[PDB]
Design a protein around this ligand. Structure first.
Ligand SMILES: COc1ccc(N2C(=O)CC[C@H]2c2nc(-c3ccc4onc(C)c4c3)cn2C[C@@H](C)N2CCOCC2)cc1Cl
Length: 113
C-alpha cells in the first residue's frame, strides 16, 4: 500500500474537496485565514490550540506540493476542524460552522479516497 504520488496528481485529486469547503458561505469565512488571537479578541487561543490550521495554509501546502500522501492533507483538514471544536463552545456560530464544513468534507473526501 506504499505509493509515490505526483504533486500535480495529488493537487488535481484533492483541490475539489478544498474548493467545496471555500464555497460554503458563510460557514467557511472564519476558516479562510489563520487565527490572529489579538486581532480577533481571543487571547487564550494559543493556550488551547498548539497546532493551528486554516484553509489558506492547506491551500498553500497543496499548491507547493507539501503533501506526499492524501492522508497528510486529510490530517490537516481534520486538525482545522478539531481545533475549532476544541476552542469554541458547542453553542457558538464558529462551532456550528465547523460542523457544517466537516459534513461537507466527509461527503467530498469519501469518493476521492
Ligand atoms: C460569517 O461568520 C462570522 C463572521 C464574523 C465572525 N467574527 C466575529 O464575530 C468576530 C471576529 C470574526 C471572526 N471570528 C473568527 C474566529 C473566531 C474564533 C475561532 O476559533 N476557531 C476559528 C477558526 C475561529 C475563527 C474569525 N473571524 C474573522 C474572519 C471572519 N475574517 C474576517 C476578515 O477576513 C478573513 C476572515 C465570526 C463568524 Cl462565524
Amino acid at each position: 500500500r506504499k505509493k509515490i504520488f505526483k504533486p500535480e496528481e495529488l493537487r488535481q485529486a484533492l483541490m475539489p474537496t478544498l474548493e467545496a469547503l471555500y464555497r460554503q458561505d458563510p460557514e467557511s469565512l472564519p476558516f479562510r485565514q489563520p487565527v490572529d488571537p489579538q486581532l480577533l479578541g481571543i487571547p487564550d487561543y494559543f493556550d488551547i490550540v498548539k497546532n493551528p490550521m486554516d484553509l489558506s495554509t492547506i491551500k498553500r501546502k497543496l499548491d507547493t506540493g507539501q503533501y506526499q500522501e492524501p492522508w497528510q492533507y486529510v490530517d490537516d483538514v481534520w486538525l482545522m476542524f478539531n481545533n475549532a471544536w476544541l476552542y469554541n463552545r458547542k453553542t457558538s456560530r464558529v462551532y456550528k460552522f465547523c460542523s457544517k464544513l466537516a459534513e461537507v468534507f466527509e461527503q467530498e473526501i469519501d469518493p476521492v479516497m
